Design a binder for these strands. Structure first.
Ligand SMILES: [Zn+2]
Ligand SMILES: [Zn+2]
Ligand SMILES: [Zn+2]
Lengths: 198, 285, 62, 113, 96, 366, 34, 94
DNA sequence: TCTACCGATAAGCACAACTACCTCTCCTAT
RNA sequence: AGGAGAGGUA
DNA sequence: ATAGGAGGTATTGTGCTTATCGGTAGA
């Protein structure tokens, strides 16, 4: 049981670090929370429910992301329908789902069908054990906005398709929550480069 | 690839203790090495002893010297066998509803007394009020191979771990570059099943020793799947390092810009395509 | 005799060459044919057996 | 992994268990003869790893791993950094203690932790 | 060599160097997990066994690949010194 | 005659898939124990005594027990009566092209023709199974294709023989077709075509395509080459060469490297460089190729002290070494050293053919 | 530019109720050579 | 070991390892000559020379379209795809 | 409880197994 | 004139 | 237009495209 508790503590710490990197106004107390303090605040049992929380963007309070932890593994269509109904009721456009096992193909099709209305991100528990961003091999990644993307396109007089491509399934894109059509800035240890998400 | 070579680096807090790196590396190797039960047991025999218990009780007599060398105990190996039996239980398609293992220092076996300091492990099969397991061929051909293939230490995924010394690691440390020559571990994992990633299984097996292993520099040695774990840039950097190593081994001198251009050309679509026709066709598509 | 597995020793060859009135190492003092001066270093000379191959110059001209 | 021939017809015997008899017995299908068993042993095999016969020489199975080498430790008799370290028990002590063996061909010195 | 005596001395030195290199390779072959008890600092009565078994070391080396690699590495390391004797036994006028 | 040790896949469930001994005789897949008991054997103990493994291995015993169980399951009450003979006859008759001879006659001519007795061939089969078990256990080394001890070379007595045989067969087919076409509706000279064989030989010598030793089609190449008249040395070395046929040129194996069996037979220091590197080997100066001996050696062997093979399978062998002549068990000898010494003494007195090899090995005890 | 071969003669008898078959090339200095 | 196996189970494969005390000037022993021939049998067969040619051909097919543009960027000939925004040379002439 | 695709295990099918080269011999049914 | 097969060079 | 039985044997090696083979998930 204690192994599961420390696993969940590591997952929560990595999730908070990723949210802080993405800029969702994460409090310093959560980032600097120790294992002993987390266990003391945990109580007797977590039941994968206390990890559910809602976070809003630092720049704009209108945008918010809800983190959902299913009670049991191998979720089905009913659980996804309940989650999307809850999102519609709460009026949230983004959500992060952390699951223990791979999703049902029917659940994946349901997520893809409703991807236009709301954006859903799925992360495995094993993938969140180690923070990908905090690595020596991974260089600094900076997400460019629409104005900066337009300035970059106009400066080199190039099209969006005539840029180096990065797949959505890459861990960095999912870590930064990058959608299709967004460019990034990479600084190597100096010469810089840009990658187009496709 | 089936070998799927890995690379693990020790943490920086082990240097405070005297000879901390060597002890940590040896502990990691001991904990993360697959040791089959057959390598410890010497003589396996089935003795007719006569939920009700079934006949044909199997005996596994193990010398104490092997356990002392491997730093194990009879209780520990019995617990590991029970845990692995209750972990999968996919094989053994017969009446093995219950399987209990008992440990006895001395057994009532008068067949041979060559070794006096050997501990005997008793495995008893339980049948659900049926005689379907009364035959000897079935147990001898199914249960005996199953127990010998059960690893008492490590994980089934990890094949072998060796300790190596290097001076130019693929992932340099941020600070403290004055340390000329570090020590790291190389892990090889089986690729029998492609359903689960080798790195994913490796992360789960290192939960008790997460602090010891420095995950800030550890990275798979492969190039194709490293982009799916640490991004395209990390794979490109490792590819550049491997290309430089190959050029150095070839004995020729090649400028950096050529290798960088090769790396950027082979990873322009976000993935390292092969040099065959299929890779070029996919890149053009 | 020059049997491949019964070759005479180097000492025997040197003694045989010394008894002939030449240097035991097979090198003899020579003089440059262009200026007449004596070379500082002796040049090894010996009647080896050579062969002529069937590949010619005009056979490769294209 | 044991077999014997009954004296009546000189044919192989297969082991069997009888609930009423509660004793190991051997009888053959060739003739009708039941004989009492000895030592109550029906299988006895020494565990060996000789499965890949005539294949361990070509492909290196790494049956005996090589001891690790380190360069951080400095030898005493000579100023050589390369050394071999391993864990082994003492003559009468308990636990595993770290040992060191110098890699200098001209030194041949070994010391404990 | 300058004369016959120098040639004989060089031949004897080469023979002794090859013997020393072979001994070094035999010593290096023991760096395996099977000889951890012998390599430890304790009391072992099988010291003469590892020395008298001279014809078995080559057979063991020819069967394993890691042992062969260790042996060839040790042989090169011990044979660099043997190769270094040419500068001592060679004159400055040698064309080679 | 092939004896194969492999996992059973016929009438075997998932629980029982252990290795068993099978016999591939005339493509029948007969169990080994049924064949053993068909050749005048009526006891399991006698069959085990014939296969003198002389070792303690669990795998061998398990394989033997599995083979016995498979034989028992395949045929019921095979030990009693002659049910094994009926089963093997049915298996032979089940083939696509069964032999015309009956079961009582097929076992005498198509099964070990060297041994006339029906019980001696059972002992030979037991010896073969013993050798297979010893090789499986690792006590006996397996044969290698690189060594010259297990290889033979043919220059003209066999290379041309198969071409002559196939051309004669084609000529006979044409002649009988013409005879059938002409009988229904002539000198014998017109019946036989005298040009078919000559044209075939001319084509073989010109194109260089020679008949494959084991395939009717897929003619091999490189058998016949041209001489070189640049110098007498070239035409002398062209006449003295040895060629080994390999399936593919890119990879061969260990044949490209020299072998200790080349000592004094072929030149290991000289070999062509290129695709056929090591495949073409030049013969040594003192190299001779043995020819078939018209004299009978069996008669002279009994005079030296050789004892004939025992017909009865019940009598075992205590220490008598096996005597094999051209792969045929001819007899037995009490002491091998004295026997081989006497044979060598007789050979040195011109009482035996000068081209004969006498091999004595204490490991194989033969 | 012809073939150095020798003819083959063997008697063939037919029954109801030396002919030429082929030429084999002859190696120089063989058992049958001038 | 040269006579098949040393009989210490029977081996099937070996890794040759020999030391030759004699030199070319002194004269090679027949067994030493055989060992030298076995060792030098390598490079006599030229069948692996296709690997560099095939690798060079494939790499050239992949990298032929790469050229430098007037804007200072590195672009591919197919669709003017941007490979490198700026050349990563460590000087000294641009 | 019966549909409904959905990843694994064998079974074939298709290229790839090097340049610049230079000679000779043999080939085209019946 | 085009092919098939062998021995060969850098 | 006709002709060219039948034999146990003795290239790999990577991608690609099936089929089939169970196999759970949803109503
Ligand atoms: Zn016991
Ligand atoms: Zn009986
Ligand atoms: Zn030292």
């Amino acid at each position: 049981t204690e192994e599961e508790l420390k696993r969940l503590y590591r997952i929560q710490k990595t999730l908070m670090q990723m949210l802080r990197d993405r800029g969702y106004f994460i409090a310093d107390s959560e980032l600097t929370m120790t294992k002993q303090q987390f266990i003391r605040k945990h109580g007797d049992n977590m039941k994968r429910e206390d990890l559910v929380t809602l976070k809003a963007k630092r720049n704009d309070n209108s945008d918010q992301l809800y983190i959902f932890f299913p009670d049991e593994a191998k979720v089905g269509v009913k659980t996804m329908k309940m989650y999307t109904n809850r999102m519609k009721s709460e009026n949230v456009f983004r959500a992060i789902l952390v699951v223990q096992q791979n999703l049902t193909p029917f659940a994946r099709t349901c997520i893809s069908e409703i991807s236009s209305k709301f954006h859903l991100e799925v992360f495995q528990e094993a993938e969140m054990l180690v923070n990908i961003k905090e690595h020596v091999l991974v260089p600094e990644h900076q997400v460019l906005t629409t104005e900066e993307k337009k300035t970059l396109l106009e400066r080199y007089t190039v099209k969006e398709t005539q840029l180096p491509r990065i797949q959505v399934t890459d861990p960095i894109a999912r870590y930064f929550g990058l959608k299709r059509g967004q460019v990034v800035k990479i600084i190597r240890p100096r010469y810089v480069t840009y990658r187009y998400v496709v | 690839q089936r070998e799927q070579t890995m690379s693990l680096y020790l943490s920086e807090y082990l240097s405070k203790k005297k000879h901390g790196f060597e002890y940590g590396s040896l502990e990691i190797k001991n904990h993360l090495e697959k040791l089959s039960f057959s390598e410890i047991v010497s003589t396996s025999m089935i003795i007719f002893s006569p939920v009700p218990l079934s006949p044909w009780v199997c005996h596994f007599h193990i010398s104490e010297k092997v356990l002392k060398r491997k730093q194990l105990s009879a209780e520990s190996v019995v617990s590991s066998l029970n845990e692995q039996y209750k972990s999968r239980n996919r094989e053994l398609k017969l009446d093995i509803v219950d399987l209990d293992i008992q440990n006895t220092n001395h057994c009532s076996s008068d067949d041979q007394a060559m070794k006096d300091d050997n501990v005997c492990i008793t495995v008893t099969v339980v049948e659900a009020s049926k005689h379907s397991v009364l035959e000897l061929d079935a147990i001898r051909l199914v249960l005996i191979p199953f127990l010998l293939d059960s690893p008492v230490k490590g994980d089934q995924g990890i094949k072998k771990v060796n300790i190596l010394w290097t001076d130019r690691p693929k992932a340099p440390k941020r600070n403290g570059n004055h340390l000329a020559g570090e020590l790291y571990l190389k892990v090889t994992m089986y690729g029998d099943r492609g359903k689960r990633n080798c790195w994913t299984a490796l992360l789960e097996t290192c939960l008790p020793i997460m602090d010891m292993i420095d995950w800030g520099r550890s990275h798979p040695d492969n190039i194709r799947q490293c982009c799916s774990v640490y991004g395209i840039d990390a794979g490109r950097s490792i590819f550049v390092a491997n290309l430089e190593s190959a050029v150095s081994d070839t004995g020729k001198e090649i400028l950096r810009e050529h290798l960088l251009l090769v790396a950027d050309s082979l990873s322009v679509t976000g993935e390292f395509v092969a040099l065959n026709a299929k890779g070029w066709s996919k890149q053009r598509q | 005799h020059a049997t491949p597995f019964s070759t005479p020793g180097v000492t025997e060859i040197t003694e045989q060459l010394h008894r002939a009135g030449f240097s035991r190492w097979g090198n003899e003092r020579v003089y440059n044919g262009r200026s007449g001066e004596m070379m500082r270093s002796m040049i090894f000379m010996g009647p080896t057996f050579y062969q002529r191959l069937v590949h010619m110059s005009e056979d490769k001209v294209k | 992994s044991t077999m014997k021939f009954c004296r009546e017809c000189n044919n192989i015997l297969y082991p069997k268990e009888d609930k009423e008899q509660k004793i190991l017995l051997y009888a053959c299908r060739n003739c009708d003869h039941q004989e009492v068993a000895d030592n109550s042993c029906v299988y006895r095999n020494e565990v060996h790893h000789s499965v890949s016969e005539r294949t361990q020489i070509l492909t290196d199975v790494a049956s005996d791993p090589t001891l690790p080498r380190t360069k951080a430790v400095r030898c005493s008799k000579c100023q050589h950094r390369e050394a071999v370290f391993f864990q082994a028990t003492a003559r009468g002590e308990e636990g595993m203690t770290l040992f060191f063996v110098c890699c200098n061909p001209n030194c041949g010195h070994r010391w404990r932790e | 060599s300058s004369d016959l005596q120098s040639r004989k001395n060089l031949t004897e030195e080469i023979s002794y160097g090859l013997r020393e290199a072979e001994q070094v390779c035999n010593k290096q072959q023991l760096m395996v997990e099977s000889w951890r008890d012998f390599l430890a600092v304790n009391g072992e009565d099988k010291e003469e066994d590892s020395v008298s078994d001279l014809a078995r070391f080559c057979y063991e080396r020819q069967k394993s690949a890691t042992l062969s690699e260790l042996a060839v590495s040790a042989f090169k390391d011990a044979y660099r010194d043997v190769q270094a004797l040419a500068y001592r036994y060679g004159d400055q006028s040698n064309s080679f | 005659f092939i004896v194969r040790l492999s996992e059973n896949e016929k009438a075997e469930d998932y629980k029982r898939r252990e290795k068993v001994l099978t016999v591939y005789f005339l493509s029948t897949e007969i169990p080994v124990w049924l064949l053993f008991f068909a050749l005048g054997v009526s006891s399991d103990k006698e069959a085990m005594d014939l296969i003198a493994f002389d070792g303690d291995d669990a795998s061998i015993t398990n394989s033997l027990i599995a083979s016995i169980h498979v034989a028992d399951a395949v045929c019921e009450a095979f030990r009693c009566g002659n049910n094994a003979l009926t089963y093997v006859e049915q298996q032979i008759k089940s083939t696509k092209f069964p032999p015309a001879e009956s079961v009582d006659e097929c076992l005498h001519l198509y099964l070990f023709p060297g041994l006339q007795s029906l019980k001696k061939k059972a002992r030979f089969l037991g010896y073969m199974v013993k050798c297979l078990l010893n090789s499986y256990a690792g006590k006996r080394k397996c044969e290698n294709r690189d060594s010259f001890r297990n290889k033979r070379i043919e220059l003209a007595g066999e290379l041309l023989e198969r071409e002559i045989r196939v051309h004669l067969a084609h000529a006979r087919r044409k002649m009988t077709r013409a005879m059938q076409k002409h009988l229904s509706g002539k000198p014998i000279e017109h019946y036989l075509d005298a040009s078919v064989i000559t044209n075939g030989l001319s084509r073989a010598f010109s194109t260089g395509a020679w008949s494959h030793p084991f395939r009717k089609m897929e003619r091999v190449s490189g058998v016949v080459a041209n001489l070189g008249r640049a110098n007498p040395l070239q035409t002398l070395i062209d006449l003295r060469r040895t060629r080994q046929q390999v399936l593919y040129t890119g990879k061969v194996g260990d044949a490209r490297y020299p072998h200790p069996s080349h000592w004094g037979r072929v030149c290991f220091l000289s070999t062509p460089d290129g695709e056929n590197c090591g495949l073409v080997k030049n013969m040594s100066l003192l190299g001779l190729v043995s020819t078939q001996s018209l004299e009978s050696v069996v008669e002279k062997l009994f005079a030296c002290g050789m004892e004939e093979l025992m017909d009865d399978t019940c009598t075992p062998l205590f220490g008598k070494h096996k005597v094999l002549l051209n792969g045929d068990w001819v007899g037995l000898c009490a002491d091998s050293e004295s026997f081989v010494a006497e044979l060598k003494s007789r050979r040195r007195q011109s009482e035996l053919p000068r081209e004969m090899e006498i091999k004595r090995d204490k490991d194989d005890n033969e | 530019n012809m073939t150095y071969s020798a003819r083959i003669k063997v008697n063939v008898q037919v029954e109801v109720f030396d002919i030429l078959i082929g030429s084999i090339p002859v190696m120089v200095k063989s058992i049958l050579c001038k | 070991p040269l006579r098949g196996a040393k009989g210490k189970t029977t081996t099937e494969s070996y890794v040759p390892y020999g030391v030759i005390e004699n030199s070319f000037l002194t004269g090679l022993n027949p067994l030493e000559s055989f060992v030298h021939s076995v060792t030098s049998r390598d490079s006599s067969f030229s069948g692996n020379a296709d690997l560099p040619g095939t690798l060079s051909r494939r790499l050239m097919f992949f990298m032929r379209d790469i050229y430098a543009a007037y804007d200072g960027t590195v672009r591919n000939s197919f669709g003017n795809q941007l490979v490198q925004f700026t050349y990563e040379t460590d000087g000294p002439v641009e």
